[PDB]
Design a protein around this nucleic acid. Sequence first.
DNA 1: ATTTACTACTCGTTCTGGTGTTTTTGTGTT
DNA 2: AAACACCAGAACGAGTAGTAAATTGA
Lengths: 92, 92, 244, 285, 232, 289
Amino acid sequence: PFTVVTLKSVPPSLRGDLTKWMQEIAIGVYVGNFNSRIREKLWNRIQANVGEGEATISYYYRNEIGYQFDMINSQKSVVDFDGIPLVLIPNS
Amino acid sequence: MPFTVVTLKSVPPSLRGDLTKWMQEIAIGVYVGNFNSRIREKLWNRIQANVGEGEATISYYYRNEIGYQFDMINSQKSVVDFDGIPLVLIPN
Amino acid sequence: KNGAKKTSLRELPKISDRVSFIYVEHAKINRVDSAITVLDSRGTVRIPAAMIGVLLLGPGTDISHRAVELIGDTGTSMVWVGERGVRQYAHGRSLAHSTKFLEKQAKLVSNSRLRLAVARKMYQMRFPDEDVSAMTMQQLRGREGARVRIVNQALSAANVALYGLVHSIVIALGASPGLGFVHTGHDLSFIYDIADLYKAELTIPLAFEIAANFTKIARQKVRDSFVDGKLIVRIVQDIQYLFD
Amino acid sequence: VSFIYVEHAKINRVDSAITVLDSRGTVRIPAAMIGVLLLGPGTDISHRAVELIGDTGTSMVWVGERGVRQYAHGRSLAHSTKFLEKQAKLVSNSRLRLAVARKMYQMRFPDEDVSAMTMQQLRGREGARVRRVYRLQSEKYQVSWTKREYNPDDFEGGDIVNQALSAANVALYGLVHSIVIALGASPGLGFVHTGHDLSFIYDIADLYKAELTIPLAFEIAANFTEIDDIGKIARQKVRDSFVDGKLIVRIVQDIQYLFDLDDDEELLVDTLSLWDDKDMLVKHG
Amino acid sequence: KNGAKKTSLRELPKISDRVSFIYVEHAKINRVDSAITVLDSRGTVRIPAAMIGVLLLGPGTDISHRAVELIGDTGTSMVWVGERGVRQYAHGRSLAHSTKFLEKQAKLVSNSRLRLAVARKMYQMRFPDEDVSAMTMIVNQALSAANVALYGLVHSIVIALGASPGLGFVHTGHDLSFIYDIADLYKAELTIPLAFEIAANFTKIARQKVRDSFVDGKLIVRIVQDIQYLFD
Amino acid sequence: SFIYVEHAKINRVDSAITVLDSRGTVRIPAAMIGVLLLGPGTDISHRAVELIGDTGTSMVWVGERGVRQYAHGRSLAHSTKFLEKQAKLVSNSRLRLAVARKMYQMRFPDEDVSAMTMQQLRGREGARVRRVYRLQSEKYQVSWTKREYNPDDFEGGDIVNQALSAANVALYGLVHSIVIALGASPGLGFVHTGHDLSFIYDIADLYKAELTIPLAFEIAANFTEIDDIGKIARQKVRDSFVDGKLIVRIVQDIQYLFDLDDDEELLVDTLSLWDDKDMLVKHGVSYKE
DNA sequence: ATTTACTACTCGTTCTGGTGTTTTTGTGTT
DNA sequence: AAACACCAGAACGAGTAGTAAATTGA
């Protein structure tokens, strides 16, 4: 399906790699349409070549709202309001 | 009922929290939402106007030979027609 | 300008293409940067409003005039709940620039024979089939009574979400919660009527399942039931059939 | 009944009473004295309170500044529908729908009498009267005036008068909507006005237009210029006119006089205003 | 480390779930930050080389060892096209570790009876109907453009399975005989009609035309199934 | 007939190419190349590819001293003689025995093997292999017990298990290069099959017993774990390759396992027109410095 | 000849806290 | 009492330009 990636504070050996299975439409925003196994392998190729930075992925699906997404090492979070995923922003 | 993603940079805070009524925030300047064509063809004429000097980009799910379309406002990244396919550019 | 703008109708999605409902407790809603907000101990949140049909507000909750101003301006609704049940149905605008449904609803309910015909339609829709109904005046009272005859928690919760989503679709079509064909004597008659058609097939099964499985927990089953059943469309169908 | 207005406050609840914190101080009001509760800007109502209001038939209407706008609402007064069903009856049957149309066209023509004329001659007489009063007030305030030409989108693309005329008429619509919905009636079930969701309210408003609003617009246009925010000051003038409450007691009557609801069952309005300090069974300080 | 990592096999998309081709001219190609970059006056473009099946490298272009090392490692194919026609090919890896289609191809082509079998089944599957079977032994620009894109796409498909372009039932006497044969099928149906529709011009466009043609025709799975059921 | 290029640039001039290194611009017409290997630090034009395609010259993209393969081109004169003689041959369960026997005998010169069965030959193959393994081990006093080919994890491993692997991979790469350069195919195998590089494993098993195991043992004897054994292995093999004596007996074995007469043999002649310590300049190359 | 890790230095964007105001963008008998 | 426009500065990350070190991930 449709997939969108976001990278922050990553080595330059990922911002040029990911440009093969995707495109750079803005600064830190990588867009791509492809299927599930590719997606689920990229999401591990990216989990380890990231270091101290943080990233995010979001893909089309079929749920009550219409999508899902995952987060790694972000100051945000993701909470479920009785079946639906909603972002969070904790306190100091 | 395609998938829609919007990016916003350097805009008034009266467009960074309004768009959080339709859409949802996963990171900074990154707004993702699922909905149909009539809504977004209005949201785009709503964001062309009350953006100011900043930049914004949209990319939606579609059915072309690659799998998506996009457009831009006031961004230096141009857009070229590579004989049927849209590819982002970065001039000098 | 000194602010953002209010929504329109062609920037708004129908209720056929929306989420169903959200819950909120021990928080306090507000407005910020032209948006909505929620704030518990765990931390801030935000809330899309043009992609929901109902809010639910539980204990310890607070809310401010400038939020209501916004939510209502989409087509969403507000409902205050608690340990005793639903309360204080609130709502704003309606996503219908024409009033045909209300006109015909009144044309019907004014007369009494048409009222009776439609009530019989609904009496036979309440039951598993068509020929199972009964052509009587009040023996159907005992019929419904016998049909009714750590579980009331789920009973309520489901009933609450049901009432709310009904209220929403009703005001978004253009009907009136007062012009009811049964239950009359209040302002929520059409609602208390339209909701009993599905209370049976929805509330009790999962309520008993839960109450058996003792060791919130209901609101996932409720939403899965909605998504499967396709209430949000079957109800519109029932209504266009009931008023024609 | 009693009506009330709250603003710049923070509500909460006591055993069976209300508390309204503010700058001046706090107040207390057992809920069986309120009736309607017109909230307003700068107000954070609680949950533990609402569940009391609901349990007393009290109403509540999130409004702007003195009913110049309506933003939401809850369950109507005492959870009743008398007005609603007796409106549906009168509008459904096409024999009664004229007994309450040529009846309302009468209360605004006091001298003449029309019980025979029909739905097409009224229109042409109404129009002429309005064209007359407009020119009257025009030549009064020494202004140029030809007709009501405008465009809805390009609001800021016309003369200076039409602007304020529209704005004031809209604030009037707002207050009328508020009170109507607070009673239990319905906006769309209209007699002269058809289809639109807010027709009955245009029908009501047409009673009050020509004595409150154009004598406002023409002044607002003479004593002001193009470099201003006339659309703001019209709202504020009507807000200042709505303070006393000499239009919330006329509306209940102009309603109960159409539907023919009897005298014994009528409603008695009382536009209260808190901090008068002359009340009974009301703690204070 | 000292660089990025190479592409695996499960991280790649099949040749059917991909774009078909991309053109290039008067530019310079290179590797930058572990990517494929294309430089020119208009600016600087980057290429998704794993969502593509072939490049075409027109005049004036230059390319470096460390760029082909990366392209090849995906499944894409390089082809140096030119006004005179096609010129030499290139390919790094095959998206398959089975070697079955090639085994059967060798088995079949070794002998001659069932070679002539497919040789005449070519005339069968080529011309409109079966009743026409005979089992008895300003436009050139767009024509060659379509023929070029087709040759390259055929090369990609062939190598994407394990097959060889050298084992040609007809057109033999070279190493690109098999793909010449396979391309002879779809040439007439596709090449010439659009070729004339363009040669009637009054003002490149061939690329949009052939792209839409393939998109509507499902050429990828067409050729895949043809080869499957022609060797089975 | 062969060539190696690196740290250079190329272009076309009037049926000849024009390299560009630091010192000067060598030059050579489009008749003496034949095969052509390309190494790092090369960017190549379009009019040059035009020629290398329009003349029959091959074109390849290889690592440092062909220790790895990266891409292909067409083949010398575009022939398939090796491909045809390989396919016609492998598609026969009977004729696909004599060439295998030959390959088996090239590693057993003292005894004849044109009587034994395939299943019985692998036993003696493994015997000889373990023998050379233990022999090199006892020679270099290295603790050797057995081989471990894990194609997933290189980390744990063993220093010899790590160096012999990389040396064998470099050998695979050079064999791949030469094979594709001739015209053959690496999948149409005889001993190994089921994967696309089986003929490679087989035709490299010949040289694996004399070129990479002694190297690996001399590497493991006097080195440490902290060093990049995987970097020094391919470097040693690159050095060993610089000579060019192993590019010659491969082509001579290809023409011999398919039974090609002498009048079909070809001239395998390496070339090095650019040196930093010796003088090698003659016979037609017109340095246009 | 090409390409990568690593460094230091600009430049720009974003975050956050005190002030002074306004309660809010406005067909409807043209 | 609640929520916007505005301004001041403080903190953190993206981008360019030179240096040394290899030809690669097995």
